[PDB]
Amino acid sequence: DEFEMIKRNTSEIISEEELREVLKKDEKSALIGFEPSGKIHLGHYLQIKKMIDLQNAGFDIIIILADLHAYLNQKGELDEIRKIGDYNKKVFEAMGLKAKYVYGSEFMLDKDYTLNVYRLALKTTLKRARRSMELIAREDENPKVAEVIYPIMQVNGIHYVGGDVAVGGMEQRKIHMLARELLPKKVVCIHNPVLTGLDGEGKMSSSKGNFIAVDDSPEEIRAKIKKAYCPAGVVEGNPIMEIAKYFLEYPLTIKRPEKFGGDLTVNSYEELESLFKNKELHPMDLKNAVAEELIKILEPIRKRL
Amino acid sequence: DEFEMIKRNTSEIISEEELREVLKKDEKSALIGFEPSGKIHLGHYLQIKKMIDLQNAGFDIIIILADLHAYLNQKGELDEIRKIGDYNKKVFEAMGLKAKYVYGSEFMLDKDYTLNVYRLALKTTLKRARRSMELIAREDENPKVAEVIYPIMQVNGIHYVGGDVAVGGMEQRKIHMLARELLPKKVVCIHNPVLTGLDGEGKMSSSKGNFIAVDDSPEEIRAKIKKAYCPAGVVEGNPIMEIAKYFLEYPLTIKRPEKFGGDLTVNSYEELESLFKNKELHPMDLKNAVAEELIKILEPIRKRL
Ligand SMILES: N[C@@H](Cc1ccc(-n2ncnn2)cc1)C(=O)O
Numbered sequence A, B: 001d002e003f004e005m006i007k008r009n010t011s012e013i014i015s016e017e018e019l020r021e022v023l024k025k026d027e028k029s030a031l032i033g034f035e036p037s038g039k040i041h042l043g044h045y046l047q048i049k050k051m052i053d054l055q056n057a058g059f060d061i062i063i064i065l066a067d068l069h070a071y072l073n074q075k076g077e078l079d080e081i082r083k084i085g086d087y088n089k090k091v092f093e094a095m096g097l098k099a100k101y102v103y104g105s106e107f108m109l110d111k112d113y114t115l116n117v118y119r120l121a122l123k124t125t126l127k128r129a130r131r132s133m134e135l136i137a138r139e140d141e142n143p144k145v146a147e148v149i150y151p152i153m154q155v156n157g158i159h160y161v162g163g164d165v166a167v168g169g170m171e172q173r174k175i176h177m178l179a180r181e182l183l184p185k186k187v188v189c190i191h192n193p194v195l196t197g198l199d200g201e202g203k204m205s206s207s208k209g210n211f212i213a214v215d216d217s218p219e220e221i222r223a224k225i226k227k228a229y230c231p232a233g234v235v236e237g238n239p240i241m242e243i244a245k246y247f248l249e250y251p252l253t254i255k256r257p258e259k260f261g262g263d264l265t266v267n268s269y270e271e272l273e274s275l276f277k278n279k280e281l282h283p284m285d286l287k288n289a290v291a292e293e294l295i296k297i298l299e300p301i302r303k304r305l
């Protein structure tokens, strides 16, 4: 089922009923935007996977390589950001997604767009805009005006592109709630879960260096998985369990010596969850399985580059 | 000075006198070998730097891309090793090293070469060979015959290539002592220091994932440096200090707020060592300086792609 395929592994859909209505349409577009990242990690991959899920559902996909937004979010100069964006496009392409790749600054500085940003700036309170940026803005002891221009420019972007659907992590939630509230056409929002960092603290961001990159070496992957936070019986905030939930193909065979129970096949992540919670499967065996299967999945991607 | 340039930042030279005698030669070669690595780190860079030092001293440089040795050291199949080796050549070339690059298997399987390995297998005791491999061999509960073939094959390689100088990390010391005992011609051995891991525990290897890759994103570098072991007034086993010693140019300016002492200029690593031990320079400020300067240095390398 197309609905359940798209719903699978999302934190929320705003709204489920509106999504149904968009599925009855032949031509339908979905959008996502990315601040260019120095290294594309699993969070990105999780989202690109959802875009492919949407594509296989008949959606035309649009990727905003958000150079301006990165500029506004203190990620350095536009010219170096556009390079990183190009590298990000190449990493996406390797993941097996065909879409329209658009740099933000291609349409985000035109007279009328700018005018509409200011139109929305009249409609958005400073407090509302600052709240929408809590999980997106760079840490700054002295928040810049640029921080509050960011959300309105994304909302306008959403308007300009004209996507039936907008996709992002749960960090994007508040900006999307804004978009729905302020624009004539309400966009259907699909929000993906925020992966936990490898050491287990906070969440997994590109600036925290707590991630598995899609082109990391098999030795890195094994070392990162090996080092990672993964307490016995604990599913919540466990990044290894998350990688098992969001990336791995089931049925999954976990190779273990007979000394420690022997190999065990699991038909579903729920089964794995169950076995892990009641101490039936040790973290180190979970880790080795996840690490090897992750390599097998990330292998074609690492090769292309 | 040429000798002092070559000596700069080495753990040892075997021997200093023998190096001098090689310096009076017009034609002189220096070799180093590498087990192909999925990611090229600072440990590699430190050595390629030393190879450039020798290059500028009038040394024809030979790089052995040791595919066979990696095969013997359980790094997987030969065909995939050769690819990683190719990628390794690309990184070395980016470091601005022009030299002869050679896959081990190009000459390490010829009748006479093999015969000479066996001639040496007859001269080398199992205990001696196992000892030479303590810091090189992959961890194994059940050590393989391949482990002890490795060191004799490197010695024979050293002999075959005919290099005046052999260069490597301190892990290669014992195998080099062997080569000097067993071969008609004694090779001058230049051993580079082994860099500490970012968590401060054990040396930095490409399989412990405790390293900074030369092509890491500026944010990874910043997060890696940020998380790294670097205790107040502690120089020994401090990777950040080591990075400062082996990679940074002097005079060095360390940017700090006037609140914490203001910017300070150091004209030598020694001065830095002093300031750090005196606790006159804080870890965080050391880190921030080291990270920004490390980016500037690793920038053009990362650019070649
Ligand atoms: N805020 C997103 C980036 C992002 C940038 C731009 C856009 N859109 N959507 C329509 N037009 N531009 C969406 C997300 C982040 O945290 O990476």
Ligand SMILES: N[C@@H](Cc1ccc(-n2ncnn2)cc1)C(=O)O
Pocket: B031, B032, B033, B034, B035, B064, B066, B069, B104, B136, B153, B154, B156, B157, B158, B159, B161, B168, B171, B172
């Ligand atoms: N044992 C070195 C690799 C290495 C391999 C081969 C060679 N040579 N030298 C001459 N002929 N082959 C040197 C080092 C490591 O631990 O990476």
